[PDB]
Amino acid sequence: PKVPLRTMTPRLARDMSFLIKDKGGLEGMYYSRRRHRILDIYLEKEEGIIPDWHNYTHGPGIRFPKCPGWLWKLVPVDEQNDEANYLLHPADDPHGETLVWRFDPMLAHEYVAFKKYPEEFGYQSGLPEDVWKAKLKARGIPFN
Numbered sequence: 001p002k003v004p005l006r007t008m009t010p011r012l013a014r015d016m017s018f019l020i021k022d023k024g025g026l027e028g029m030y031y032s033r034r035r036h037r038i039l040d041i042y043l044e045k046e047e048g049i050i051p052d053w054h055n056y057t058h059g060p061g062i063r064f065p066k067c068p069g070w071l072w073k074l075v076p077v078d079e080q081n082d083e084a085n086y087l088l089h090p091a092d093d094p095h096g097e098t099l100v101w102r103f104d105p106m107l108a109h110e111y112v113a114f115k116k117y118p119e120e121f122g123y124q125s126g127l128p129e130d131v132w133k134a135k136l137k138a139r140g141i142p143f144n
Contacts, residue, residue: 003048010069013053014108016043017071026101031074033092057117058141060095064113066121071107074099 020026029035040051056063056074063074076097079085093099118125119132122143127135136143 001048005048008053013069021103031099057113066113068111075102
């Protein structure tokens with residue numbers, strides 16, 4: 001780490017979001033857990049940001065950021081040439097959806113993940129324990 005390690009704050013996430021936007025990053029690029037990890041390791045190395053913050057809701061559909069101030073979301077988008085598919089994809093999303101990063105400044109004014117999917121925050125849901133667990137179980141999302 002070139003910088004002392006620190007935790008993500010909403011203000012830092014907001015500043016990062018607009019800076020990445022201005023540099024042309026992320027917008028329209030295909031999401032993957034691999035690219036996701038590459039981003040978080042780089043941000044720990046270069047910005048000293050502990051990689052515990054970059055999480056999205058479970059889906060399916062639009063995946064909303066669980067960090068207030070992160071202004072990026074994952075939006076779903078719309079193969080019998082198997083050999084070419086092998087050459088380009090030889091070997092994943094639990095809902096089989098292809099996602100792209102999308103910038104949304106309104107996420108600074110509405111904490112969509114917490115307000116529409118509070119149960120995905122577990123003991124930080126603001127809901128009784130039996131309530132958020134039952135909601136997660138009905139949607140197939142484990143809570144360990």
